[PDB]
């Protein structure tokens, strides 16, 4: 839905990737593509970021192959796919592999709501795809396999000789996109960061282009049988033509208009909150909110957002402009639907429509008006959480929205009177995630000491694990469009039940539940940083075990690195899995250190850096006058 909307509204942001393909010889051998040459796309990229769950899920249950018969066969297919990306991107200065860690509670509720459906479908109707979760035996095998493959590449591929390889595996918290964004913010905060640094990101989700805008790096690219580029620079030209308004009582500033448009996109739909009854992206709800924003921008006295914080007094004007239209939008929807479906229970198009809605969906007495306003305030708090999570890192790990449904815009009263404050909370341990987001069918993925809690009628938490649950299709046509009426986790009860037991775990299981660390790997060829790491950590004049990178010697990677205990440099590299389907190396040319980002103690800021040199116009005078007219 998001792509079909974007492609049709902004078609010039797309271009096909120039791919150079390996030569196959008469004996069936493959010649590897020499990536030391210039990139055939005609522009050179400093950094590549991989959202690795955009690869691991496809390999386990593909559309166009049989599934892999064992875990080693799956790791080999993951290397083949990952290698193909680096051959076409050819990153000159950083490669980052990010794997999903433990997520914030607000996201876990959406995963639980996905996985209970997958289990009830399999129950109503081999490798369980729920095994792709932090703290399973499968994620341990992946976490070893990726470090081997990077070390092996740093020994055997000349284009990687100057590359830094940064790994953030499943033992480190946060989702891949919410790791990658924090690394980009860390680099932008550094005083020596090159303002014309070129970035690429690989991943499946439509949020990546919204994140692209929210970086404010102008040359940023997004990547996704053939491949296509999306350019953030071309989308910024579209928005600069479309969002402009004359004669405003304040200085016009494009970055603020782009942030307001980004917020109005997350308002229409996101993973953390149910979408408003009045809005679906298929109905061009983004245009409706944009029109309301352009009509109120002359009188709000300024923009709706400031560096990822939202002005609730200004938000009221937007919601009032929507509330005046809800009854017309419902009539327009129902007229079009009843017209279409004639030609092919709540009654939203008749009078009294909101009283029947609150009765049928929330089970309240319709005459309680202030309950509607309470749901409204809870939803507005949700919108404030979502924007901060994208622009300023995770604002609370324990917050969530406690309803299966959304209020009407007519329920948002006096937002200017709200107080919004968030508490950071405790990040869940990997087993605390696994017990939160698994139904009892997949319990083979978790230690035996917890299995009873999922299935025993005497379990103190059995109510969190229903054997059957209601799905409301809500006038939609598919069980993936409908809402699962699953009960919410009372987190203290689950944590108490797992604080009891725990001493029963194996010493391996108890070790697997600890938090991890990021690592940087480099090749012995690197022209300065390898001299520094060997001299500072491994010469006889042993220094402190923590070290600060220098941007003139690191090629602009800024941060700190740490010596790893018990590791010995330049031993033999050994392939970890049973059948030796990949080579060993007798003397490993690579070296490994822990890696630490420069911490965002400040807010990040939505501004162009000094020394930015924006690309020349991709849009013509005619394209600008067409979109201004539309």
């Amino acid at each position: 839905a998001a792509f079909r909307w974007l492609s049709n509204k902004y078609p010039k942001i797309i271009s096909p990737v120039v791919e150079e393909r390996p030569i196959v010889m008469p004996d069936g051998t493959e010649i590897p593509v020499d990536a030391t040459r210039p990139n055939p796309n005609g522009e050179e990229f400093d950094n590549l970021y991989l959202d690795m769950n955009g690869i691991v899920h496809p390999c386990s249950h593909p559309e166009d192959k049989p599934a892999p018969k064992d875990e080693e066969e799956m790791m080999i297919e993951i290397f083949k796919y990952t290698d193909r990306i680096v051959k076409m991107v050819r990153p000159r200065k950083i490669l980052m592999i990010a794997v999903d860690g433990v997520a914030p509670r607000a996201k876990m509720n959406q995963q639980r709501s996905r996985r209970f459906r997958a289990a009830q479908e399999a129950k109503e109707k081999a490798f369980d795809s729920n095994s792709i979760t932090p703290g399973t035996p499968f994620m341990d095998i992946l976490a070893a396999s990726l470090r081997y493959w990077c070390a092996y590449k740093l020994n055997t591929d000349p284009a990687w000789a100057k590359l830094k390889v940064i790994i953030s595996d499943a033992t480190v918290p946060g989702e891949g996109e919410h790791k990658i964004m924090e690394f980009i913010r860390s680099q932008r905060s550094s005083p020596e960061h090159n303002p014309n640094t070129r970035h690429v990101i690989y991943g499946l989700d439509a949020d990546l282009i919204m994140l692209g805008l929210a970086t404010h790096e102008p040359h940023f690219r997004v990547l996704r049988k053939p491949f296509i580029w999306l350019h953030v620079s071309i989308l910024r030209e579209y928005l600069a033509a479309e969002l402009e308004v004359p004669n405003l009582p304040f200085r016009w500033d494009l970055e603020r208009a782009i942030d307001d448009w980004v917020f109005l996109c997350f308002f229409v739909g996101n993973d953390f909150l149910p979408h408003l009854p009045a809005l679906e992206i298929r109905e061009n709800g983004i245009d409706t909110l944009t029109a309301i924003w352009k009509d109120n921008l002359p009188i709000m006295g300024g923009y709706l957002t400031k560096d990822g914080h939202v002005d609730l007094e200004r938000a009221q004007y937007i919601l009032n402009g929507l509330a005046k239209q809800e009854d017309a939008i419902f009539r327009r929807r129902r007229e079009v639907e009843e017209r279409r479906e004639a030609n092919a229970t709540v009654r939203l198009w008749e009078e009294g429509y909101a009283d029947r809605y609150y009765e049928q969906k929330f089970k309240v007495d319709p005459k309680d008006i202030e309950f509607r306003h309470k749901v409204g305030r809870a939803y507005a708090e949700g919108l404030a959480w979502v924007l901060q999570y994208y622009y300023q890192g995770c604002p609370s790990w324990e917050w969530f929205y406690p309803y299966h449904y959304a209020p009407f815009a007519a329920d948002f009263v006096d937002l200017a009177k709200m107080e919004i404050k968030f508490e950071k909370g405790r990040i869940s341990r990997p087993f605390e995630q696994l017990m939160s987001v698994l139904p009892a069918a997949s319990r083979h993925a978790i230690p035996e000491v917890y299995h009873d809690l999922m299935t025993d009628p005497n379990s103190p938490i059995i109510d969190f694990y229903p054997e059957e649950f209601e799905i409301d299709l809500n006038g939609k046509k598919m069980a993936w469009q409908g809402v699962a009426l699953l009960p919410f986790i009372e987190m203290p009860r689950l944590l108490a039940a797992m604080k009891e037991r725990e001493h029963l775990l194996s010493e391996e299981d108890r070790a697997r539940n600890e938090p991890g660390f990021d690592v940087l790997l480099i090749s012995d060829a690197h022209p300065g940083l390898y001299e520094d790491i060997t001299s500072h950590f491994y010469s006889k004049k042993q220094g402190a075990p923590k070290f600060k990178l220098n941007p003139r010697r690191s090629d602009g990677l800024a941060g700190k690195v740490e010596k790893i205990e018990g590791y010995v440099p330049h031993g033999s590299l050994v392939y970890p899995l049973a059948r030796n389907s990949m080579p060993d190396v007798d003397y490993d040319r690579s070296i490994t250190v822990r890696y630490i980002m420069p911490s965002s103690a400040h807010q990040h800021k939505s501004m162009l850096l000094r020394g930015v040199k924006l690309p020349p116009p991709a849009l013509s005078r005619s394209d600008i006058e067409i979109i201004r007219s539309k």
């Binding site: 932008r188 905060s189 005083p191 020596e192 003139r552 400040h602 800021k605 501004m607 850096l609 000094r610």
Partner: protein
Amino acid sequence: MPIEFTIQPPDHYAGVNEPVKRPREFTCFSYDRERRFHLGDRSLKWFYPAYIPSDLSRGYQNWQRHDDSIDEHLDGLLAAIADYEKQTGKPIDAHVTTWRGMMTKIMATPYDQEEWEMNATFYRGCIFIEENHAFARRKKMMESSRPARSDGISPNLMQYWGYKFETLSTIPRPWGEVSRDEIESRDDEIVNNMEQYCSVVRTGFGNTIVCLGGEVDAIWDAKPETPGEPINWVELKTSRMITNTGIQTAFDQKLLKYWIQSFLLGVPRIIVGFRDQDGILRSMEEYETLNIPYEVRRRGLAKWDGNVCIRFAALFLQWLRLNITEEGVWRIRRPFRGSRIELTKIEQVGHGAIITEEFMNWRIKLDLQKAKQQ
């Protein structure tokens, strides 16, 4: 008899690539808004650009001025060098010491017709040079006694359209550490020009090694990890919009002095702001200190070439090192359109006020340390 150095036409000096020993910063000092001297970089600022349409005349009544009736001689430069000598336990190897402004006037002399006047002195084999403050003040009294132009533009208003553009174009910390409000609010900050960062550099022309002091406006990123590497300095300047090629001639003549002034401290980048004739800022442009002579040569609208300036400075410095050999004060003068620089000894002993007693006492202590070491 008076002593004289003949200024030949540029053609006489041209075609010889006299070697320049690349500028190194080796000590630095700050003035704050109240004109207290401090060692180190506390008054340095980071560059970050202005809002393109803004009024340079805004706030003119509130401008805090450094009072140029006060004479500071060399005081900060001598103090900053004396600290480096205390830190290293040796005298510096440079034997000529000056503000950049005198070095610019010398280097411009083959092309510029303007008159200039200087006082100079010698001590323990080393030479020190300053502008004659009395001549500068008398010239500025005569310039301010002229009748106004038909456009009404005051030279003082032109000078404020200087410093306002520096306040619109800077921030007190790297971009990563300032708030949004500290960038957006800058139109309404009241301008001060008593606050400065002075960089001291070691440099040399041919066989002579020279120590220069001078002002530097801003830096593009952090200072380097170790001394003597190139630094990403910026100089900020303002002039009227180049509306026609008659203005381009005057601008390509200004670029001789801009290039000298940024070259002598190793400043790699100049950023120029263009005002309209009422004082609204209309655009900004970037120039590189290595390429300014090449661009002016390529347009051909002005006729100057820095190899003349460099060799003229080397020959003139060597001529001073031949003619000046003893203490007292000498006056150097260039008459208006004069074909010869004049030299004369004006005071027989001491230094006037060109050198501090603290600097004398420090060098006396240092020569006593040489004797004690030997």
